[model samples]
Target: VIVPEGTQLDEKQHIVINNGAEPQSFDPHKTEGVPESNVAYQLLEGLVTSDSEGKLQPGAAESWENTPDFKTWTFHLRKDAKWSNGDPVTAHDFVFAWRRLVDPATAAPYASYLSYLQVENAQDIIDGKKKPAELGVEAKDDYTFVVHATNPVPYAVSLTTHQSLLPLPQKVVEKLGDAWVKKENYVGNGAYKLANHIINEKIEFERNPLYWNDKETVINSATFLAIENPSTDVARYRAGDLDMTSYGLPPEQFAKLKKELLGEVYVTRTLGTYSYELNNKKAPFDNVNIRKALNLSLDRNVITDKVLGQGQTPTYVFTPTYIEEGHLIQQPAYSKEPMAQRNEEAIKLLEEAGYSKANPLKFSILYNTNENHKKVAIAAASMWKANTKGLIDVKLENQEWKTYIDSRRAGRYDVARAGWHADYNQATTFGNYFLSNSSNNTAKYANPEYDKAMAESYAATDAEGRAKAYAKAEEILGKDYGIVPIFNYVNPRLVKPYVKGYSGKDPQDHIYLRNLYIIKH
Candidate 1:
């Protein structure tokens, strides 16, 4: 296709996409959300990676093996792997990166991820009880890396695909300090390198000629436009200004776009849960009765069918139904009750918690800047008020992506819109998020029973043991009502027909620019 200079698909096979929001950060260890992850996956590679078909593949590491007990993992680096700057990627880089990630000083939100992986002394390092270097990862040589886990971690190899575990250039980072992530100083081991990043505008990446597999990379460049509104993304996609939409199509426009765009629209189930997080440390919300009331009052079906109108499925459980381990999950009794009965019970619980017509329960619903989030928030607020017969009052508040994340992390909201996209294909990915010490535990939920169940799950050696433990943890979450599960995500996005190699089969919904090619119409 002969394309114009300013068009999305240019003569160079450059592609433009709506990346949903301004990326939080480019540093793999510090990045927290999907927007940043989408960009990071293109620029930084972990020890392992997932292909377009969602199968685990060799990344910087060409091969890997684990002990019979699954407590020790060893990886052999690819001899041809090189950073964007042409420096050979090394095992020591992974050692340095893993240590930095677990270091208390780094204050990475994903520090708990290492602990979840059962890396020896990782929790101690995160607790400031041990030095970062004491963490279990080690470099045997320039090309050999080894990791020792405290327990038999069955998913240890698969966990390496997480962006937080991606290797960093130790020399570059130590020399440039915090400025190492800047486009001018950045050096990555992925197929692409940072070209430019303008905050709230767009981030651009160019193909890394020094990449080991650059010979097979089809796209020359990729651009992620910081377009937060899904509705705006639709206009851009329709105008051929975007090769694909980032987050998804606006729920309200899904049916219309599906019919009009036909082959361009994609709706596939993703391994994620859309939910509301109640501040368990705050007043009123700390009351289980209040929390349960709020959770039970919401009509998830209406929100998913009428408000969303997308392919999302209403869920009473935190983990999505597509997960293989979901069969082990146990739901609360209210999950089976009718909406009307649930509403009545919710009202009774609120009354028992000292809220009524004279004293209505008042709280704010916090959400990030997105048209769909706004729609859901409005519907939830309306439902709570109507369902309780004016016994509840909800104020809606929205913030930009960064501020919203900060507010939740700081425990500055009553109830916040939250979602969890799995880092790996495991039930623990959802179970571990609510751990008391988890940095991502924005709700500040602290339950010893839940923690115990998760610990047992991580320490389990057999699939049956692990499943039983995880099922117990999930049961705790459902009973506590700290997080209200609304729906299982179905990624609904627009992709130009000319964009080849775009697969929606991956439950993670990961897209690699290196795997894509621009074909003529």
Candidate 2:
């Protein structure tokens, strides 16, 4: 259910699988993404985390206070924190991680990763307008660090949890040179160690004995086996050699398995907002009416049920309620009628834009090779044809994950199916794809108002204010009519009864097999 680490990568220079968070590129400075932040979420500890009830609680830092100005916030590092390599997980790692993220030459998509980090000159510094040291983050010693925000931003604490700033092994990254994340060179200070990995085979992790909770970890070794063939996955389960499988299960096969083995099925909704991102700066999409018409052209309900399945819910906003309270605000101004009523409105807009089905604007829809995604594309294609009565060609292009990223970055596709999972339950993590300045916003889906709202929200004083900012921004993007939210992903999986200890990550489908053990067996 969890989006696997970029196993789809072929290891080329332009794009490859992301190796956990921070350090986006093969180069250590650019941060690609994080392997669920449990490592930093637990490994180094932090000022806060949610409890079993999912409410935020104190972790590494016993307690701390933020200044009214939001410029001088400080956290107390737990004295007992230590790295897997035996080094103390001190405040120093924060300093090391911060400097690296903004080092202009690093070109990390995450250079802007820090929240409220806009502190006065951080952006200017990274933009070569100021020195790195002038950017507001300063470590008083190994245990204390001070963050100076360009403005008194409200989500500062939530910002700290971003993977781009997770502590990296200063010695290891330095020792192995730039490619430390490779199978042999990668160093981890997480609850689990990278025990083994084979290209196109599997990635295995053994509990980190040094992990503070290693003694409580149920599974000694957790292996994530990629079964690209859903059919093969069911066959393996029938054979009984495999403990679990999801990647290769057909909806019908899963239905049968669940019916036959009711107690073994598990499902949880994931945070995802898939939309049709038009090149706002370019041709047809540049026309506001065309964008609005395209937005209303397809039926999300039909697309969601047909392409994704019942597990995922069709949505309007880029952010999900599970992640944060949000709605499809952007599209509402375009139509006062409910979603079902919008179909007629869509046709009206297209007509006003001077287009009919036969004389329709021809464009391509891009997607990766996933079967579910293909179904969605085809369904949309069919619906667009029906509604517009035009020639709509859904060009199904399946690119490797890295290739997809590169292609999207180059602004190569017209519209594609893309989604985001919560990084650390924070509201800001989901919108990184649309930031006008973000390297990942390779699609060039920019709105001056959207960017300004985020910038203002970043400076808001509390979660409520920032959440409000996000609401306003979401209205323009997700809710307003900019993006097509197909559904929020609900991870459905078949976990054998024997796998009793398999605990799932927050916001669902990403299962931690390393957390599972042979309890019943």
Candidate 3:
């Protein structure tokens, strides 16, 4: 037994965990959601990765440096690095991955992430005006890769830590097709390799002997479950079937778990925002009055305290506080007033927009089937109905995680539950999401002024200049009611005491199992 209670260890030395949502897709270049990102982090190693403290560190690349102008970057790959199939990971693998991501035919939603680097020919390729071969990455030799940029990208190194920059072994992928990630054909260069997978049940990973960092890898194996309900997840954790959970425990159980589990329950600030995304391309919402009315109708304080009962901070800005060139960018403001004041204005806006008791405004709040999200969706629906005095008919629609994501992407919801976790530590990370052409802009909100402001933020050289540009862009977003910002999130997790060397980041929950070890008593 690993725990003092009845928790027995797996014979395979696998640490069981719950990742909340099932991975939508495992294709590193195509998946844009966090669930997929969490799994991909283990199966793929980019040029750099975020450490426990969310700081950047080398991964596939042994070392890298930029030219004096900072417009050109050279990466020296580790010759010893090899994929699970024993193929030496070369610079051409990265070149192939980059080209595939931005190729016009591929239609990867996150193709714009490459354009953020101002990569040579990237925009042209995305616009279908240039060939993928002309996309500006070169294999200087078998082990050296070079990237030429249009400008000095300040966040260039941080950008490398994202999964979009991960390499794909050319031979393994072409031969295996979509089955490349399956256990039998799965070939990865990271510390762990796929051993087994059962959709929505469990996924098993074993130590990758061919990995360059095999000697440094601590855990021999890891297994993950797809328990959607927190109550069931906590039950399994308490029964010693799980070593940890990727997301927070049920909100109602937080108090008891904290008292009983002691150091096992961790609550810390994370760089994320929980919000309701409005479909601006659709009716009623297309009108700013309807958007603002919906946004202002709910009482955020009540939702955070009475409903969620968590320590998340109610916020007016979608972007969490971030640093730009050493200065912290405080949350910018909009038409947000005190709850009572805002509710009164919301009613006025709704009435003025032709919504009345006789002709009520009707819409639905779409969310995934998690207890917390259900609670929030119900709470917000109640608040809107109660405050509006039947002038609005706010319905609730819940679905499984995968369906919810697809539905949101397809704009099938009137108002959908959403969250934004930063890809990097800068304000632009959040600001860039709503850019007219961004695939992440689920609301389909398009405004030339907002797009122009974001573009200007990228072009600015100085810190103050960049901050002001982002502030302006955010101001435009907030004013337009493009999104409804509720609260800044804190990750809540359960960890057994013996589970050592595991550390996570504020931006996203990613566990590096290679650093995990069990200190048995």
Candidate 4:
């Protein structure tokens, strides 16, 4: 519907976009980053998918419904939905996919996602206490898929839009194993199917003629280029070699690009946050005062306004303010204080913690290898040193995406630069990351009160009850100071004028190729 009737079409309906990094993996269950999700969204269709405006829409499923108690849900798959190889996309495929995701042997990074959805026995399965077969999902028929949750799950449908929930062809997966992701073996049900993939260069996808809605798909093919350098992406965009840049834009060059490109440059507020994770289990960071001091000293305004200058908002809380209605965010009291006053307090706290003039507090800030990340890390380190009047000695360390994520997951750094976007639109999406038992809890922040509040939120039947519980969790996080929230994210990128249907409204920034068409400009 995004492409108007009788719209002028390009000679070749193909688009090339910078996908940011070389994707770590193509397997939906095993991959854990944005690059993989970007590619996966094109190759796989979940039971529920989002529109250009981020509204939930029936995907492989024609319709779905939930029980009155919200403990069970059923999806009615479309009979016309078929994989690239002409295999029927059945309810059994979803059963196999969900079981595989929750299996302990899979070591799926987002396995906790199902656990958070309260999928029956998912956590037990992930813990190796239950078999994957015990997961409470069943195929009533070839077309009907039912999911049983251990508790009320209001966000079940929304959660299914994530890549981790995408169904896989069980026959192909079992026969080919890990090699099923290769272009020759891949059998996807989405509008696009794998054509070719050259690591560190590009991953290509061609429109799937067998797709249920392929008749409506406008674009014929798409290419996701692995270009890590923002400047290089900008150059490619200017040279007319790429239709869209990745999620990142060079912060320093944003003003110039916006001025020259006019409507091509986009800056949209998204449901995500840029923050630093202070390792709560480590020595210096274990001291709450040290944690508070480091957090209070960083001037988020400077980072957002002067440093990034890309319409990002300074944030004092973990969850973005615009995520949900009636969900109040409880920020720290000192959040309103002036930068100078906060710095003075931070210095005093550090001095009290036995770190001052002679024995300066020393630590390294670890971040991934993006120019924007490096700039932010440098600015933060400089701020920490200046604000503390040389009482802090901060070192900067940058690594590639793979090694950096590995280090963070292993808790191998003092302070690690972190960013999180919502997997679904909810407070719990952000709050669940720091849970003591969470595999994604890189900071190792453990607070019983916080855990209790999150548990209550999950069990709450009404939105009001869930909101109140989430507010309590946010308050606890503010008081704990384990994660130092710097700013709310605003996605800044460039898109060619010829690219139609690339709506910048999605808070998650999910770009679906099925909805796009290259206009003859």
Ranking by TM-score: 4, 1, 3, 2
The candidate, 2 or 3, that scores higher on lDDT is: 3
* Whole-model alpha-carbon lDDT for candidate 2: 0.59
TM-score of each: 0.96, 0.81, 0.94, 0.97
Write out the backbone clash pairs for model 4.
none
Q: Which ten residues in a row have the lowest lDDT in candidate 2?
A: 9-18
Query: Candidate 3 residues 1-521, lDDT tens each?
Result: 11235544334556888877777777887678777777787888989876656767789998999987668999999988899888989999999889989987767868988887779999889888999999999999999999999876777878888877889888898787667766677777888877888888987888888888777666788897888888888889889999987676688889989899988887667778899999999897999998888777777888778876768888766777544432434454433556677778888999999888888988888988888888888888888887877788878888988899889888898999998877777776788788887767888989999989877865677777878877777778878889888998888888888786556444555677765667654
At residue 345, candidate 3 shows an lDDT of 85
User: Which one wins by TM-score: 1 or 3?
Assistant: 1
lDDT of 4 by residue, 279-339 (tens): 8999989999998998889989888998888888988888886777225776678988988
Pairs clashing within candidate 1? none
lDDT of each: 0.86, 0.59, 0.80, 0.88
Better of 3 and 4 by lDDT: 4
RMSD of each: 3.1, 6.9, 3.3, 1.5
lDDT (Cα, 0-100) at 432 in candidate 2 = 51
Per-residue CA lDDT of candidate 2, range 242-287, in tens?
6666522466566677789867766655655566666666677767
TM-score of 3: 0.94
